[PDB]
RNA sequence: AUCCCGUGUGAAUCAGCAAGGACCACCUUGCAAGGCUAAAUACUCCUGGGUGACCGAUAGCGAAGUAGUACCGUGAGGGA
RNA sequence: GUGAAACUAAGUGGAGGUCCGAACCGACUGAUGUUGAAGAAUCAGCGGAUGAGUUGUGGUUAGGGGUGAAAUGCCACUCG
RNA sequence: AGUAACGCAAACAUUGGUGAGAAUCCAAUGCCCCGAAAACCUAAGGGUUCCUCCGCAAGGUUCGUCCACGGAGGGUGAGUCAGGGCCUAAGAUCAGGCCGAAAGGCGUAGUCGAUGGACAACAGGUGAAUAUUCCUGUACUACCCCUUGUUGGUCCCGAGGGACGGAGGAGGCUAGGUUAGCCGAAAGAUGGUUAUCGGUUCAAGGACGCAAGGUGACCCUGUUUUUCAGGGUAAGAAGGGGUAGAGAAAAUGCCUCGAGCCAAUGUUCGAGUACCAGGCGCUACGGCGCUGAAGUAACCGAUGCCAUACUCCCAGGAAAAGCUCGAACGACCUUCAACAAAAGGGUACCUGUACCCGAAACCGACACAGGUAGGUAGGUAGAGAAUACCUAGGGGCGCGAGACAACUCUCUCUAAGGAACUCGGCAAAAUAGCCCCGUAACUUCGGGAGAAGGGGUGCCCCCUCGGGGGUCGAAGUGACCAGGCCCGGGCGACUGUUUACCAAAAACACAGGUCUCCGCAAAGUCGUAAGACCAUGUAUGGGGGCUGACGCCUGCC
RNA sequence: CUAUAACGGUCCUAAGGUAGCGAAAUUCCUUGUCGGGUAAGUUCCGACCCGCACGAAAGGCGUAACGAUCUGGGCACUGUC
RNA sequence: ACACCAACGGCGAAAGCACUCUGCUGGGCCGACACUGACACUGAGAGACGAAAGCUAGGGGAGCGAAUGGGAUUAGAUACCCC
RNA sequence: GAUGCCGAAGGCAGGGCUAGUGACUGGAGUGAAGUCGUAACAAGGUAGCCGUACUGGAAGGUGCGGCUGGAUCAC
C-alpha cells in the first residue's frame, strides 16, 4: 500500500551494520579491497553504516 | 488407534529446516516449503538390541511417514519406537534374535525365515539399519534362498538378491488405507508442505523447453522434455555399471 | 628444428651425449637433468635541490576557504 | 425397525479453503487529479476477511545467477 | 506575470495584554472539530528537534512580537524497568579435518546469534526540562556477615523437569460501567422546580483461606444422565513411600499409603494524621499557604484472569540453560575449610533513560491530503471495536478580505414521461434492520435460498409472561447505518493467484486423472571438486511430462 | 417426378475423422436459411449442416454450485435522455 | 478348471451344487406314543435369495475370447474358415 | 351520520391441472410395380430360439450362459 519510492524504511541500525558494517568488510577479501580503496580516496568515514555495540548510538 | 501421549525422549525438534535448499541455499528439490511444523521421532530401524522381550504399549501418529508407529517397552525399561506391523494390537509382545518364533513384529536374519514369508523393514547391509519396505502397506516376499544370498520380491515388483545375514521383520506394514484418502482441496496439499507446480507448456521459452508458442502450445519438441533438456519419457537413468547389478535379477514391471 | 608441459613408455657416461631449422653421414661447437650472484635498464605515494617560449581562480590537482568536505546513494560509488 | 443390521423424526454437538460484516489485506467501476496535495493518490462505491490468511522482528537465496499458484513478472522509482 | 497557485469543504468570533508595528503572539469568554483518534504510552528510527533567556538577516508558501529557525546557557540519576555480566532457534563463523590455479568452498566440536526461555518493586509526593530511576512509606532478589547443625563438598558425568498446536463452547471471576445510599455545595434574573451539581479513591507485597466453580475409577437404585441420595468395591486422584533386574537417581515391573485436590478471586494486614469535594486566607492576581465531610450497596459485565481447564479435530503442534534429583568414572579443593538450614544485621556490576513517535522531528527531495509493529478501550442509542452525538484528553487544518457572472468540480432537488440516452442502464436512483407468513425449475441431495413474493413495526394504557384496547403523524428500523431482483446463454467446476505504476481474465493454480523414470552408495538438482539437497525419507515413497472437480467417454494410423 | 444417395467402381496413402458437437472465443462468402424474442433485431436463444479450416487427455460432450467474468432480455427505479 | 468314477444316479426353495480333507451349519426322510392339542392351508402389499452378461473399487491374468487387426473365400463379406 | 368485524366482483403474485399451437426432429401404418441385400421357414445352406454385451448400411454377426419348440445318427 506504500509507494515504490519507499524502499528505504525504518530498519534497526543493528541489522544494517550486520550487513554493511565495519566488522563485516573485514571478513571478506573483497571487503578489504573496499577499505583500501576508500582509504585511497581518503574518505572521512570508512563504513557509513556502523554501530556502537553499546553507547549512545547503541541498538539493544 | 490415535491418542496423543506426553513426549518420550524419542521426540526431538532438531532437524534440517529449509526443505529443498542445499548448502548454496538454492532450491534443489522443488515444490517444498510451507506446511506445519513437525518433530522428529527417532525410530528404531536396526532393532539391533537382541533377546529381550518387548511390549507394545500404544500406537501413535507420526507426521513424517505415512505408516504408524508403536511405542514399545521392555523389561529393562528402555523405550523404542518401531514401525507398526499390520494387524498388531496393543498388549502384543515382540522380540528380535536369531532363533525366534515367526509371527507379527518379530525380527530375524534371513537365514531363519521360512520361504514364502511376507517381510518388511529389510536391511541391505549388515547392521546398517533397515531400509527397504518402510512405507504404508509395503511388503516383500522372500521367494528363494541359495548360497550366501537370499532372494526377495520388492513391493515395486523388482526381484533382487541380498545377503542372507541381513535382519528383517515379519508382517506387512500397517495403515493400509492411507492412499484411499482423497485430499479434496488445495489447502490439504499445502498442509503437507507441497507447493503448487507449474506445467512446462505454460512458461516462457527461457524458462523451460516447452515455451510459449502463440495460443496454446502443443509440445513441438519432437519429444517431451525435462526442465533441463532430457527426454522425459522412458529413458532409463539407472547408472549402467553400478555395483548393485550382479544382485538384481528381474526388473520391476 | 630449438624451448617448455599432461598421459604412457623409457636410454647412454667421454670408445659418451647434445646442438648446428625434418632426417643420415662427416666435421665444428658445447657439456642438460644442483644452486647463488653487483652494474648498465624500468618507475614516482614521495624527499632535497634546480630550471619552465607551463596555468593564474570556467585555468592549474577533484580541492588557492569545512575537499574527498557539504550534499546524493541501502551499498559499491558519485562529488560541487 | 428386525433376532442380527438397514431405515427415519428428535435433541445434543459445533464441521466448514461456509455465509453477512469492521479491523486488516487488496484493487473491480466511476469521478476528480495530469506544470498533481501525491513520480500511481483522494472521493464514492467494490473483493477476501479461520485461511492456499495478515503482519512484526532476525535471517537465507545474487546476475552465464536468484525467485516465480508463470505476467518475462520481481530482484532498492532501473530487468527479454 | 505581478499571471497560476498558497497543499481538503473541522470555523471561527470578539474583548483585553505585550509591542515601533497584530486576521496570524499570550490570556479570557463564547462557538466548532476528533474521540477504536486528530487521545495517552511504548518499539524502531531521528539526534538535542526537549527546557530557559535573547534574536527576528535567511528558513516558515502571507504575517510574525512567534517557531521544530538562529545565538547563548541548562537538561536524561535505576540491585528490581529494557538489553549486557544467563540459555539456546533460524542463521552465521568455524580449531583441528576434506577438497580447491590463488582468493577461497564444504564441514565437526566450539563460539556467536532474540523476535523466544530464565530472572527481583509498588503507591503517593516533588517537579522550568527526569522519575517503577530523586524523596517518604511498606516490599523483594543475589551475594557477604555472624550464631547453630553436620562432615567431605566442587565440577565432569546419569536423569526428572523446563517443553510448547488449532478450533469450540460452557463455567467461576474480576477490570470497568450504571444506578441507589451516604456527604458536601447549590438558586444558575423565565411558567414551574431541587427532580440539580460535585465527591464516594487506594498499589506491589505478606499472612490467611476456597464453593453454587473445576477435577477425583466402577456397580446397583432413582433425580432428564447432570448438580444429588444410600450402599459397596480397596488404590481407585492430586500426592507420597517401598522393593526387584547389570540397576544411585531415573525408566520399567510388582506391593503399599492416601479422599481430597486445583486456582483465579475473596477476607485481613499493607492503609492513614495518605488522597480528595469543598472551606479559609494571600494574590507578582501566575500560583500559593492553611483546615478537611462521607469514603458503602445492588444490578449489568468482558475480547482480560483461572487455562497448556476442559471437549473435539488432523495438518500432530522449538532447543538449551537456570531448576529438582543422583552411585560408580575423572579432575580439583579440603578444616574452623566447605556445604545445610531459620532468624538477624550489612552489601548493591556496566549501557539506554531528554523530546517526537495514527509524526512539521521516522519513511515519502517539501512544515507533502501518503506509509509506519505493539499497548490502554468511558457515555447514550446499537448485534458491534459499524454508525451518529458526546466525556477524558487534544485541536480550529501558517494566506486573508470581499463580490455571488460565464464555466469546471464536490453535492441537494426537480413538473409530464421513464432508457427514448449510450458502444453498453456507464453514473445515478431504487432496495435495505428485525419478527411473521410463504418459497420454483434444477441438483453432485450438500444446495438453489435472505429464492421470488407478501404482511407487521411509533407512543401509550390493560392481560399473559405473545394477545387486546387507545392515540398522534403525510410518513414509525421516521437520522446515520442498511441486499435491487428475475429469465437466458458462452467460458472456467469451486475459495484462491497474477502483469508494483494502462490488462484480474476465459490466463495460472487446484483436488482428481494418466504416462515415464527411480531398489537406496535411488533417480533428479546444485557444485571445478569435497560435498549439499532429495531424506535423518524407502516404491501406499521420491523425480519429471501432459490433462484438469463430478458424470458419460476416450475411435482409427 | 424432380431431386438427393443407403449401394457399387476407381485412385492414393502409414491410415483416411468413429462417438459426440456444429455459422461456434472456430463460418471465409455471411446480416447463411428457418423459427422465436422486438412496432422495427448485423447482437441474443433454438434448430438446419453446404464443418473455407470442430473432434476425443495440446481431452470430446454434458453439468448442480460459484464469478468486481463475457453476452441477450424483463420488472422496480431513476435528470441517462 | 477338476479326466475315469458319471447313471434314463444324489441333494437343493429356485438359481445351482462333483479332485481330496477337516471344521461351523440348513433342511429331508424313517421307527417308536414320549409330549402339545387345530397351533392349519394360502398370501394383496412387504422381505430375502436369484444363471450368464454388465458396472463401481482393489487385486489377478495361463488358456479361451466379444471388440480390433491381418490372411483368405466371395460380385461384395463390416460373416462363416485361419493367424 | 360516522366507525369496527366479516365481506362479492376487481387487483397482484407464485402454484396445480388441461386446451390449442410451434421452426425442426424421432419412430409407426398402409401404399402392385423402386434400391440394397437374403435374416427366417428344409440340417433354410454357419441348427433355431430366450437373456445380455460389443460391432455392423440394413436384415444381422460373434462372445457368454441357458433351453429343444433341434435335424442327422445313435434305440
Ligand atoms: Mg548516508
Ligand atoms: Mg517436545
Ligand atoms: Mg520431557
Ligand atoms: Mg551460505
Ligand atoms: Mg497434480
Ligand atoms: Mg500444474
Ligand atoms: Mg504465458
Ligand atoms: Mg530457475
Ligand atoms: Mg531453449
Ligand atoms: Mg513449444
Ligand atoms: Mg493457435
Ligand atoms: Mg639448444
Ligand atoms: Mg639457432
Ligand atoms: Mg632434440
Ligand atoms: Mg608449458
Ligand atoms: Mg647412464
Ligand atoms: Mg655448442
Ligand atoms: Mg653434467
Ligand atoms: Mg634440455
Ligand atoms: Mg648449470
Ligand atoms: Mg636466479
Ligand atoms: Mg568563480
Ligand atoms: Mg577549479
Ligand atoms: Mg577574473
Ligand atoms: Mg447452538
Ligand atoms: Mg470464509
Ligand atoms: Mg443479512
Ligand atoms: Mg486494474
Ligand atoms: Mg476506496
Ligand atoms: Mg469491504
Ligand atoms: Mg457489499
Ligand atoms: Mg458481497
Ligand atoms: Mg465478507
Ligand atoms: Mg476452521
Ligand atoms: Mg510469520
Ligand atoms: Mg510485504
Ligand atoms: Mg507471486
Ligand atoms: Mg541504487
Ligand atoms: Mg524495480
Ligand atoms: Mg516491464
Ligand atoms: Mg519577470
Ligand atoms: Mg495570462
Ligand atoms: Mg485570470
Ligand atoms: Mg487565483
Ligand atoms: Mg499546485
Ligand atoms: Mg494551508
Ligand atoms: Mg463530533
Ligand atoms: Mg499528535
Ligand atoms: Mg506525547
Ligand atoms: Mg526508542
Ligand atoms: Mg539546531
Ligand atoms: Mg520549544
Ligand atoms: Mg524573518
Ligand atoms: Mg516571511
Ligand atoms: Mg519587541
Ligand atoms: Mg532554538
Ligand atoms: Mg544451528
Ligand atoms: Mg566458511
Ligand atoms: Mg582450517
Ligand atoms: Mg557446529
Ligand atoms: Mg548473546
Ligand atoms: Mg526479548
Ligand atoms: Mg527484568
Ligand atoms: Mg538481566
Ligand atoms: Mg516530559
Ligand atoms: Mg511514581
Ligand atoms: Mg529506591
Ligand atoms: Mg503508603
Ligand atoms: Mg531473597
Ligand atoms: Mg543436563
Ligand atoms: Mg513457547
Ligand atoms: Mg467467559
Ligand atoms: Mg467495581
Ligand atoms: Mg439518573
Ligand atoms: Mg436520598
Ligand atoms: Mg427558571
Ligand atoms: Mg450525583
Ligand atoms: Mg492482597
Ligand atoms: Mg514472610
Ligand atoms: Mg465442591
Ligand atoms: Mg534404582
Ligand atoms: Mg538399589
Ligand atoms: Mg519409581
Ligand atoms: Mg451476572
Ligand atoms: Mg476474536
Ligand atoms: Mg487485542
Ligand atoms: Mg490441547
Ligand atoms: Mg570419584
Ligand atoms: Mg544439598
Ligand atoms: Mg525517563
Ligand atoms: Mg520518557
Ligand atoms: Mg502547514
Ligand atoms: Mg502531512
Ligand atoms: Mg500521516
Ligand atoms: Mg462505546
Ligand atoms: Mg442497526
Ligand atoms: Mg447496551
Ligand atoms: Mg467511528
Ligand atoms: Mg472539550
Ligand atoms: Mg476567499
Ligand atoms: Mg462560491
Ligand atoms: Mg423528473
Ligand atoms: Mg413525479
Ligand atoms: Mg411520474
Ligand atoms: Mg414506468
Ligand atoms: Mg433494449
Ligand atoms: Mg437505444
Ligand atoms: Mg439514438
Ligand atoms: Mg452501476
Ligand atoms: Mg445511491
Ligand atoms: Mg430521493
Ligand atoms: Mg422496510
Ligand atoms: Mg430509505
Ligand atoms: Mg413452508
Ligand atoms: Mg426435479
Ligand atoms: Mg435446504
Ligand atoms: Mg440458476
Ligand atoms: Mg428459507
Ligand atoms: Mg425476503
Ligand atoms: Mg436464482
Ligand atoms: Mg416490508
Ligand atoms: Mg410496509
Ligand atoms: Mg400502529
Ligand atoms: Mg381506551
Ligand atoms: Mg394498534
Ligand atoms: Mg392517521
Ligand atoms: Mg400505519
Ligand atoms: Mg451499501
Ligand atoms: Mg447483505
Ligand atoms: Mg452465466
Ligand atoms: Mg448449447
Ligand atoms: Mg455467441
Ligand atoms: Mg475461475
Ligand atoms: Mg464468498
Ligand atoms: Mg503475491
Ligand atoms: Mg497493471
Ligand atoms: Mg498484487
Ligand atoms: Mg478478479
Ligand atoms: Mg497468470
Ligand atoms: Mg544420487
Ligand atoms: Mg507412485
Ligand atoms: Mg508425482
Ligand atoms: Mg489446460
Ligand atoms: Mg474430464
Ligand atoms: Mg451429472
Ligand atoms: Mg430418374
Ligand atoms: Mg466399397
Ligand atoms: Mg463407396
Ligand atoms: Mg473391387
Ligand atoms: Mg500403398
Ligand atoms: Mg500401417
Ligand atoms: Mg491396413
Ligand atoms: Mg459424424
Ligand atoms: Mg454407429
Ligand atoms: Mg444435436
Ligand atoms: Mg447469423
Ligand atoms: Mg469448444
Ligand atoms: Mg472450423
Ligand atoms: Mg462474419
Ligand atoms: Mg417473429
Ligand atoms: Mg430472425
Ligand atoms: Mg445491443
Ligand atoms: Mg446459436
Ligand atoms: Mg481438422
Ligand atoms: Mg481444438
Ligand atoms: Mg491429443
Ligand atoms: Mg479444457
Ligand atoms: Mg453450467
Ligand atoms: Mg475469485
Ligand atoms: Mg415488487
Ligand atoms: Mg440535471
Ligand atoms: Mg429333489
Ligand atoms: Mg460345475
Ligand atoms: Mg447335516
Ligand atoms: Mg389335554
Ligand atoms: Mg406378491
Ligand atoms: Mg440381491
Ligand atoms: Mg459375471
Ligand atoms: Mg462398457
Ligand atoms: Mg476390474
Ligand atoms: Mg493374455
Ligand atoms: Mg486364440
Ligand atoms: Mg478382417
Ligand atoms: Mg496394436
Ligand atoms: Mg477382404
Ligand atoms: Mg377473489
Ligand atoms: Mg396466475
Ligand atoms: Mg428417419
Ligand atoms: Mg417405415
Ligand atoms: Mg409402391
Ligand atoms: Mg438364410
Ligand atoms: Mg441358419
Ligand atoms: Mg430350424
Ligand atoms: Mg464382428
Ligand atoms: Mg472373430
Ligand atoms: Mg451358445
Curated annotation (Swiss-Prot), chain A:
Cellular location(s): Plastid, Chloroplast
Organism: Spinacia oleracea
Subunit description: Component of the chloroplast large ribosomal subunit (LSU). Mature 70S chloroplast ribosomes of higher plants consist of a small (30S) and a large (50S) subunit. The 30S small subunit contains 1 molecule of ribosomal RNA (16S rRNA) and 24 different proteins. The 50S large subunit contains 3 rRNA molecules (23S, 5S and 4.5S rRNA) and 33 different proteins.
Protein name in the entry: Large ribosomal subunit protein bL34c
Transmembrane segments: none
Family affiliation: Belongs to the bacterial ribosomal protein bL34 family.
Role: Component of the chloroplast ribosome (chloro-ribosome), a dedicated translation machinery responsible for the synthesis of chloroplast genome-encoded proteins, including proteins of the transcription and translation machinery and components of the photosynthetic apparatus.
Curated annotation (Swiss-Prot), chain B:
A cellular component annotation (GO) from this entry: mitochondrial large ribosomal subunit
SUPFAM superfamilies: Nucleic acid-binding proteins (SSF50249), Translation proteins SH3-like domain (SSF50104)
Stored Pfam families: Ribosomal_L2, Ribosomal_L2_C
Compartments (UniProt record): Plastid, Chloroplast
GO molecular function: RNA binding; rRNA binding; structural constituent of ribosome; transferase activity
The UniProt record lists the keyword NAD: no
Subcellular location, principal: plastid
Region (Disordered): 202-253
Keywords of the record: Chloroplast, Methylation, Plastid, Ribonucleoprotein, Ribosomal protein
Family that this chain belongs to: Belongs to the universal ribosomal protein uL2 family.
Oligomer status and interactors: Component of the chloroplast large ribosomal subunit (LSU). Mature 70S chloroplast ribosomes of higher plants consist of a small (30S) and a large (50S) subunit. The 30S small subunit contains 1 molecule of ribosomal RNA (16S rRNA) and 24 different proteins. The 50S large subunit contains 3 rRNA molecules (23S, 5S and 4.5S rRNA) and 33 different proteins.
Protein name listed in UniProt: Large ribosomal subunit protein uL2cz/uL2cy
Organism: Spinacia oleracea (Spinach)
Amino acid at each position: 500500500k506504500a509507494a515504490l519510492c519507499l524502499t528505504k524504511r525504518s530498519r534497526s541500525r543493528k541489522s544494517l551494520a550486520r550487513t554493511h558494517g565495519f566488522r563485516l568488510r573485514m571478513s571478506t577479501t573483497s571487503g578489504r579491497a573496499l577499505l583500501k580503496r576508500r582509504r585511497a580516496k581518503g574518505r572521512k568515514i570508512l563504513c557509513t553504516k556502523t554501530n556502537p555495540s553499546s553507547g549512545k548510538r547503541a541498538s539493544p | 488407534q490415535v491418542k496423543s501421549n506426553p513426549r518420550n525422549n524419542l521426540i526431538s525438534g532438531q532437524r534440517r529446516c529449509g526443505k529443498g535448499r542445499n548448502a548454496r541455499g538454492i532450491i534443489t528439490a522443488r515444490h517444498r516449503g510451507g506446511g506445519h511444523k513437525r518433530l522428529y521421532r527417532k525410530i528404531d530401524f536396526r532393532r539391533n538390541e537382541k533377546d529381550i522381550y518387548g511390549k507394545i504399549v500404544t500406537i501413535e501418529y507420526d507426521p513424517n511417514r505415512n505408516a504408524y508407529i508403536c511405542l514399545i517397552h521392555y523389561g529393562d525399561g528402555e523405550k523404542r519406537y518401531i514401525l507398526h506391523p499390520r494387524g498388531a494390537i496393543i498388549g502384543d509382545t515382540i522380540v528380535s534374535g536369531t532363533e525366534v518364533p515367526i509371527k507379527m513384529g518379530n525380527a530375524l536374519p534371513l537365514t531363519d525365515m521360512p520361504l514364502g514369508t511376507a517381510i518388511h523393514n529389510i536391511e541391505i547391509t549388515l547392521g546398517r539399519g533397515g531400509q527397504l519396505a518402510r512405507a504404508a502397506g509395503a511388503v516383500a516376499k522372500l521367494i528363494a534362498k541359495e548360497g550366501k544370498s537370499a532372494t526377495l520380491k520388492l513391493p515395486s515388483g523388482e526381484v533382487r538378491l541380498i545377503s542372507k545375514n541381513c535382519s528383517a521383520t515379519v508382517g506387512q506394514v500397517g495403515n493400509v488405507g492411507v492412499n484411499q484418502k482423497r485430499l479434496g482441496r488445495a489447502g490439504s496439499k499445502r498442509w503437507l508442505g507441497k507447493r503448487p507446480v507449474v506445467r512446462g507448456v505454460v512458461m516462457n521459452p527461457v524458462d523451460h523447453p516447452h515455451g510459449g508458442g502463440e495460443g496454446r502450445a502443443p509440445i513441438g519438441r519432437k519429444s517431451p522434455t525435462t526442465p533441463w533438456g532430457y527426454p522425459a519419457l522412458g529413458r532409463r537413468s539407472r547408472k549402467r555399471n553400478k555395483y548393485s547389478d550382479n544382485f538384481i535379477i528381474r526388473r520391476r514391471s
